[PDB]
Design a binder for this molecule. Sequence first.
Ligand SMILES: [Ca+2]
Ligand SMILES: [Mg+2]
Lengths: 235, 55
Amino acid sequence: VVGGEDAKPGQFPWQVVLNGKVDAFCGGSIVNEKWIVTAAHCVETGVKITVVAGEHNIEETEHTEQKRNVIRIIPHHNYNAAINKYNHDIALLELDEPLVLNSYVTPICIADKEYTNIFLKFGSGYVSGWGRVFHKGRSALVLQYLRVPLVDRATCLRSTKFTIYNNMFCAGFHEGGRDSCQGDAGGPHVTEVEGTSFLTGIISWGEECAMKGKYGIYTKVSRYVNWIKEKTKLT
Amino acid sequence: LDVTCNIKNGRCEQFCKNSADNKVVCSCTEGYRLAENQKSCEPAVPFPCGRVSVS
RNA sequence: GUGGACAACCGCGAAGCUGCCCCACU
Ligand SMILES: [Ca+2]
Ligand SMILES: [Mg+2]
């Protein structure tokens, strides 16, 4: 996340990092002990994925970490980047062993269709991840977070060439050096209400992060909450 | 002065719902419960979602 | 204006329906 800040050790306990052939290639959010939610384009290629919760610095060891192996990947059945890059960019990962919930490893709240959208319409969410600290840069050492204002789909469309489907939404700044980047993808866009955080978005493609007059594009969680809850249902 | 969900979320912390009567009924997300005041949400488990407990 | 792609002083109605608001003709 460019133009962000360092998250304090357990500030976003729902954040997870994805590791494969390369470390820190995508983010994710804890749904429950056995299920993570990420972006579909983070998991199209069939590499054995590894999930790490209770992370803070990816180069050091804090003894709060929990590694798990993904044993099932459910990309949203309508996702296809050949057709459209951004639309339906969401997926679920089932873990081998349950995470054990504690202060550093805690799920993100997922409201219903209606309230997820209300919370989105507040107009300011928290995005985070160990992505690029600059447009062209290395992965972030410590977890990065940035507060991103929701942007009108008309004004976003007039800026970015892309059509914004009802499953998508834009957030960030016009003439800024503030935005999520590659690596942050699959991570949480989260709105906080009375000191409780709700999953309002999934971080999508982030190449060419903070170009003048280009907002960040995020997957609108409100539209997928039923599906999430259905598939991640424990027992 | 009659309360409904479409003003200040019926003073519900998380979730509002209207009733057939002139009352609203507040609720909370999983792992929270309704407080004594029937408005606020408090934890009902060691580690409820969306909560930071480190500082 | 015409053709194609797409919740707005919160329009219809429980599963969505409508289309005030980019592209080619200007
Ligand atoms: Ca580490
Ligand atoms: Mg429609």
